[PDB]
Amino acid sequence: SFSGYLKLTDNVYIKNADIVEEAKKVKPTVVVNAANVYLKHGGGVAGALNKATNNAMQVESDDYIATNGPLKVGGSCVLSGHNLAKHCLHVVGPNVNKGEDIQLLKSAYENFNQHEVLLAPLLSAGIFGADPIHSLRVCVDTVRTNVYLAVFDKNLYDKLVSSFL
């Protein structure tokens, strides 16, 4: 199962790990993607997850967008997890670098509550430009299901754990 995760709360766990490597190892029921409204998996977690699926996640996502149109910021869709997970929950956190509303981060985390257990990144962190300390705070205060957070950056992981209230 998941291993080496530090317990933050009753249901939130955290580890300094590459989410792609965690997904290939654990093969969880749900891996969360840090998606944009277009499901264009170019960089960050999305680019890395997509690259691990040999671009199959992108092909599937483009068919989904062609049929359904874009997601909302704060919204999500469930697609295949390909070789990484049974499912991929593509969640759109606000991208503060693109001027999106940070108040939508709580709405984005609410999507996790539809799944009993998930492997996930911190939403809106990294290239999405939000404060990762704030993202972890919103995560612990919003998610009620079991979330295993994979934090790619070592120094950020240490800062998140040492500053966690």
Curated annotation (Swiss-Prot):
Domain Macro residues, every copy: 1-165
Record comment: activity regulation: Inhibited in vitro by GRL-0617.
Membrane topology, record value: Multi-pass membrane protein
Subcellular location: Host endoplasmic reticulum membrane
Coiled-coil stretches: none
Record field: catalytic activity: Thiol-dependent hydrolysis of ester, thioester, amide, peptide and isopeptide bonds formed by the C-terminal Gly of ubiquitin (a 76-residue protein attached to proteins as an intracellular targeting signal)
Subunit architecture: May form homohexamers. Interacts with N protein.
Function text: Responsible for the cleavages located at the N-terminus of the replicase polyprotein. Participates together with nsp4 in the assembly of virally-induced cytoplasmic double-membrane vesicles necessary for viral replication. Antagonizes innate immune induction of type I interferon by blocking the phosphorylation, dimerization and subsequent nuclear translocation of host IRF3. Also prevents host NF-kappa-B signaling. In addition, PL-PRO possesses a deubiquitinating/deISGylating activity and processes both 'Lys-48'- and 'Lys-63'-linked polyubiquitin chains from cellular substrates.
Protein name (database record): Papain-like protease nsp3
Organism: Severe acute respiratory syndrome coronavirus 2
